[PDB]
Design a protein around this ligand. Sequence first.
Ligand SMILES: Cc1cc2nc3c(=O)[nH]c(=O)nc-3n(C[C@H](O)[C@H](O)[C@H](O)COP(=O)(O)OP(=O)(O)OC[C@H]3O[C@@H](n4cnc5c(N)ncnc54)[C@H](O)[C@@H]3O)c2cc1C
Ligand SMILES: Cc1cc2nc3c(=O)[nH]c(=O)nc-3n(C[C@H](O)[C@H](O)[C@H](O)COP(=O)(O)OP(=O)(O)OC[C@H]3O[C@@H](n4cnc5c(N)ncnc54)[C@H](O)[C@@H]3O)c2cc1C
Ligand SMILES: NC(=O)c1ccc[n+]([C@@H]2O[C@H](COP(=O)([O-])OP(=O)(O)OC[C@H]3O[C@@H](n4cnc5c(N)ncnc54)[C@H](OP(=O)(O)O)[C@@H]3O)[C@@H](O)[C@H]2O)c1
Ligand SMILES: NC(=O)c1ccc[n+]([C@@H]2O[C@H](COP(=O)([O-])OP(=O)(O)OC[C@H]3O[C@@H](n4cnc5c(N)ncnc54)[C@H](OP(=O)(O)O)[C@@H]3O)[C@@H](O)[C@H]2O)c1
Ligand SMILES: [Mg+2]
Lengths: 406, 406
Amino acid sequence: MRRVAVLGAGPSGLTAARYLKQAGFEVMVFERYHHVGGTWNYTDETWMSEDGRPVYSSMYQNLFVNLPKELMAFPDFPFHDIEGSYVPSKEVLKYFDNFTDAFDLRKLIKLQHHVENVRPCESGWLVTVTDLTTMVEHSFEFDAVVVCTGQTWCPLYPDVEGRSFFRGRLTHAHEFRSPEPFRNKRVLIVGAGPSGHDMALHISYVSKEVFLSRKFPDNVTEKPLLTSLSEYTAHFSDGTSTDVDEILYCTGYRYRFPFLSPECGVTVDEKYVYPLYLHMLNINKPTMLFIGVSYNACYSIMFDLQAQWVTAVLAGRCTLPDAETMRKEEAEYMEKQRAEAVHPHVLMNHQWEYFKKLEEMSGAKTMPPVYMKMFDDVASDLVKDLQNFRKNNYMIIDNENYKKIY
Amino acid sequence: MRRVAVLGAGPSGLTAARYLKQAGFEVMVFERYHHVGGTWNYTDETWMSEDGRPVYSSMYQNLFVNLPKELMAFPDFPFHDIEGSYVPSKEVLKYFDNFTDAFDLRKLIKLQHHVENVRPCESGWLVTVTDLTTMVEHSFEFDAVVVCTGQTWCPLYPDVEGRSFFRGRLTHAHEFRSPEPFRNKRVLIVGAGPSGHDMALHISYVSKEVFLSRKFPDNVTEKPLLTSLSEYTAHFSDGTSTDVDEILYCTGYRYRFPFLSPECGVTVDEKYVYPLYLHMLNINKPTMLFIGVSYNACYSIMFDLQAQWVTAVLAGRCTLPDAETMRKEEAEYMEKQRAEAVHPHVLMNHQWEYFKKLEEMSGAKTMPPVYMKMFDDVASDLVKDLQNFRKNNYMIIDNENYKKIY
Ligand SMILES: Cc1cc2nc3c(=O)[nH]c(=O)nc-3n(C[C@H](O)[C@H](O)[C@H](O)COP(=O)(O)OP(=O)(O)OC[C@H]3O[C@@H](n4cnc5c(N)ncnc54)[C@H](O)[C@@H]3O)c2cc1C
Ligand SMILES: Cc1cc2nc3c(=O)[nH]c(=O)nc-3n(C[C@H](O)[C@H](O)[C@H](O)COP(=O)(O)OP(=O)(O)OC[C@H]3O[C@@H](n4cnc5c(N)ncnc54)[C@H](O)[C@@H]3O)c2cc1C
Ligand SMILES: NC(=O)c1ccc[n+]([C@@H]2O[C@H](COP(=O)([O-])OP(=O)(O)OC[C@H]3O[C@@H](n4cnc5c(N)ncnc54)[C@H](OP(=O)(O)O)[C@@H]3O)[C@@H](O)[C@H]2O)c1
Ligand SMILES: NC(=O)c1ccc[n+]([C@@H]2O[C@H](COP(=O)([O-])OP(=O)(O)OC[C@H]3O[C@@H](n4cnc5c(N)ncnc54)[C@H](OP(=O)(O)O)[C@@H]3O)[C@@H](O)[C@H]2O)c1
Ligand SMILES: [Mg+2]
């Protein structure tokens, strides 16, 4: 391998570019937006941009992180000085802009370039991209392709009996930018994950009555599963019903890679991408790898170790089994996800053991154990104390210990 | 049989009230809007009103009728004497306001009364409505109920592969009010019926790229069946693709009667309501009848005759076949609908025979043959000229003859 394409310049693509560059590859990064940083960029556009391509960002106004900045920084690139552990979103954008300049990656990135197609070409890959400033299509040959285009832009909707009859306004979390369209409305939020809880909190400030349906301020009434809709009325599994003007679906996202031609060898289902080894390596075409298909983890460690493992594979330095053994282990792993009732690429129940395995394979520096200890202490605080957890401040003391500040 | 509910005060319900009153019934008409005339009222509201119930009107700005006023009038109540046959929609709303006052029907109509539930008790009916001026619920007992609530408000959408991936704006003909939101957009209209054709025309004045997809002005490009969608691209049955910002579905409407309790004995599917005899009588509960479930016909004659047949049945002047025989005839008729590849309640192919049967059963006067002559002729005009047909003017000379003026 010498020439490697990275698709996307969010946190996955930037961290890939860092380590691929480190490794002496010739790297090119394609990014459709006009700034690096991925979903940490806020735009008022939703769905499709005036520039003729999709909007990939689901960031909204006045968002604060849900994990302390101490766990969001890479172990060897600390956060810039800012007061507070639970920073606004624009500080994490700044952190990735600073990362990009600290590791001299900006000269690698083609901004406002939208990847339209990726297909195998003999032993290599052919990537077709449009320069959105000129609308000209350009073509590029690579020995390897690392896909880092994210999974929080293509919405997933529940199927709800009677939805076609509802005559209020329907929206999804992707398009939420501020609570203003919900002012004085009766709002049903479906899905009580991070988006549902946070959006419920932001909407509770402007709206008449907010309902949160899951299978808070006075404002927010909890509901069980939504089981049908009629013209202006939502019906719950508990037999109760409430009239609503707006439904906001916070039911998450599906995987979607429109540029992958079928010849790339990957099947993309709503919550499953296969066949990948360790959520990264395309077993059918092993010079294509993905970063960021797994989720629900300590993301800074996940990006850093995935990018080093992908780099080690491409550099010929990783301890890999044969394709048959990778298919077998992928199967075993996905049987276990079904037994634990989690989706295929959810790392939460075994992330530390997974990260240890990526370190052993790739020769990455061992993670400071304080990341594990702090994450395990604080990560579910959004669930446990939604209204006040962001008031807490932390400081890392050394690679084993942290403290809570006041 | 004395007290009869009519649900809806559009053309159906007003012609029902005319004949039920003349037969000495005590008639109450419930209408949710603040004015009679049904779809012929234009409102800027779409979907749901600020009064808390649905918007049933799909009328849009600057609409001109697609049938000459001389065929839109009842044979015994002529149109007012304005110049021109293809009048703007306000002249038809005026026609029905004039009709309402001619037959002294206004005193029977409870305006701003939205029907919420209809159920049988014993051989009569309980009808529950909300007076939207006070938000008080009221119920009333009746010996018969005539359902005239229309079928152009609950939208029907095609199932198109990949539709959940499209990120442009989707709308339905129901909410079309003016071409303004389509200005300088690449618009795909799906469905080349009257809304399709007419919407396309209206939209072609504000965008130079309209595509009309079917199973014209310069900038309307014809496309064949839409077979799949992706993020911003429509793909058609000829294997061509076009990028689009907006899709407008002109695919029609579905039956929907939210107020019918299951005990009323009617099953309502998208394009089929059953079991009805001759599109009117509820065979399970035969003091419930429908007017205007049938469509695609010379509507003036259809509403006049259905209302006189309903009145005959309810007054004991028309004695019907037993239920077994009605079910057998309904099943033979529906088999012929399928053989002719039309929807269950579509009358176009046999309307004159159908109307003659209704005249015979109901005791109504025979229709002027001029209606049939003219209707079949404008139908010929339709086979021609979306841009030009409305320039024609007609005058009825007598019972059998008309003449056209260019
Ligand atoms: C509302 C919200 C709040 C969040 N809060 C937090 C938090 O507080 N803490 C936390 O740790 N994580 C949080 N996350 C998760 C976080 O955003 C993701 O973990 C992180 O952004 C994933 O990085 P990525 O590089 O994999 O994807 P992304 O950040 O989504 O980046 C993908 C990049 O690919 C580009 N792209 C996509 N398709 C193409 C194409 N065809 N051609 C060219 N470019 C392309 C996109 O423009 C984008 O720049 C949040 C996510 C959301 C939606
Ligand atoms: C855009 C458009 C253009 C048209 N152009 C033509 C044309 O040029 N010529 C032509 O002949 N026909 C045309 N038609 C068809 C015409 O509108 C209908 O044939 C006619 O209005 C049907 O009369 P109706 O009384 O059956 O239904 P509607 O006119 O739809 O009336 C039904 C009534 O029931 C009321 N209602 C519904 N639900 C409830 C409830 N729960 N409680 C209380 N009230 C309720 C509604 O408010 C409405 O007043 C057009 C239709 C549309 C949608
Ligand atoms: N910084 C912040 O404050 C913030 C704010 C918003 C979002 N985010 C981030 O955004 C990313 C995505 O979060 P998300 O909340 O949008 O997606 P998510 O984490 O995928 O949560 C979606 C939730 O909806 C549930 N669901 C699915 N079908 C449902 C139904 N019919 N009724 C009710 N619930 C249903 C899911 O339950 P099942 O899993 O059981 O199906 C899941 O709990 C995460 O990284 C999160 O951290 C962060
Ligand atoms: N100018 C006017 O005064 C005016 C304007 C608008 C509407 N109208 C009236 O409004 C009423 C409703 O009209 P409408 O046009 O909205 O509904 P409609 O008459 O039911 O027409 C719907 C059309 O959609 C087609 N269709 C369905 N699925 C399709 C798909 N997947 N792709 C392409 N086409 C598809 C139908 O063909 P199939 O039947 O083969 O499925 C039919 O041609 C009519 O009385 C009409 O005259 C009048
Ligand atoms: Mg090691």
